[PDB]
Design a protein around this ligand. Structure first.
Ligand SMILES: [Cl-]
Length: 287
């Protein structure tokens, strides 16, 4: 049986990674290139739509359109749950991890008041895992998961302390079906990591609800994806595993039917999956 709808939303502040970014990695990397920062690359690049790491709007942009809300999207492609980014060359210029996004958002308010009606959307952790796998992190995956969860909890606590009262916290995605993870033969590693994050984060959200009357909504992206992938024809999908736009080891021409694909590139869903995710997220809120 469904719960009562939550209150209407008219402002979202989004924090996170490439699954949310609507143009910050593009704006920041053009700035970094214009200033000659060492190692800077133009992100996301020439096979991506309008600075999104996809072929269309991200889920949080769809959530904002469905709710009739303005969106301030702080998310940066590559962001980890702590201070920094998968792209280590960004650190010398800006701390673009979740903790850095929160810092910058609170610094851009004077001593000014966080809007207690705004929805603070948090969607991060994938790059904690991608950086560990790609650069041979020595932390056991269960410890990496605990770090990701502690960093998310810390961001919620800091935003709450500053005045935030409403949150939407997104689970880990199904990293085990991400094309790059499958090609790397890292499926069971991804499963252990994502299950540890997803088991522990709801326990931390219960603790945080004890304080400040926080509204801490949880979106289980794994439940969402498992349902879509088990019933793909219902949603017009056909190809669940191959990227529409290959980039590894090199760029190849995009598929002709991208709205029938789950994945855009080796890491990121298509606009169609972002649309379905944002509609699923919006279903808990009144208009
Ligand atoms: Cl562009």
């Amino acid at each position: 049986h469904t719960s009562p709808l939550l209150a209407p939303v008219r402002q979202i502040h989004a924090f996170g990674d490439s699954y949310s970014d609507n143009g910050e990695s593009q704006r920041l990397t053009r700035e970094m290139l214009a200033k000659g920062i060492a190692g800077a690359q133009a992100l996301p690049g020439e096979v991506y739509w309008q600075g999104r790491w996809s072929n269309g709007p991200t889920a949080v942009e769809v959530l904002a359109r469905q709710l009739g809300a303005q969106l301030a999207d702080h998310a940066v492609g590559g962001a980890k749950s702590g201070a920094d980014n998968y792209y280590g060359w960004m650190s010398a210029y800006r701390h673009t991890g979740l903790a850095g996004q929160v810092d910058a958002y609170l610094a851009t308010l004077d001593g000014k008041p966080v809007d207690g009606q705004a929805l603070h959307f948090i969607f991060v952790s994938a790059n904690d895992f991608f950086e560990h796998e790609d650069f041979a992190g020595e932390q056991p995956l269960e410890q990496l998961a605990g770090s990701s969860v502690a960093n998310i909890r810390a961001a919620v606590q800091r935003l709450g302390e500053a005045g935030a009262r409403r949150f939407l916290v997104v689970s880990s995605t199904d990293l085990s079906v991400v094309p790059a993870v499958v090609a790397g033969n890292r499926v069971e590693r991804a499963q252990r990591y994502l299950q540890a994050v997803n088991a522990s984060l709801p326990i931390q959200l219960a603790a945080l609800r004890k304080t400040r009357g926080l509204e801490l909504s949880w979106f289980d992206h794994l439940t969402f994806s498992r349902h879509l992938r088990r019933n793909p024809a219902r949603y017009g999908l056909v190809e669940l595993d191959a990227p529409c736009q290959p980039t590894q080891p090199s760029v190849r021409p995009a598929c002709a039917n991208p709205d029938q694909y789950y994945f855009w590139d080796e890491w990121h869903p298509t606009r169609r999956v972002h649309q379905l995710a944002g509609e699923a997220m919006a279903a808990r809120y009144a208009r």
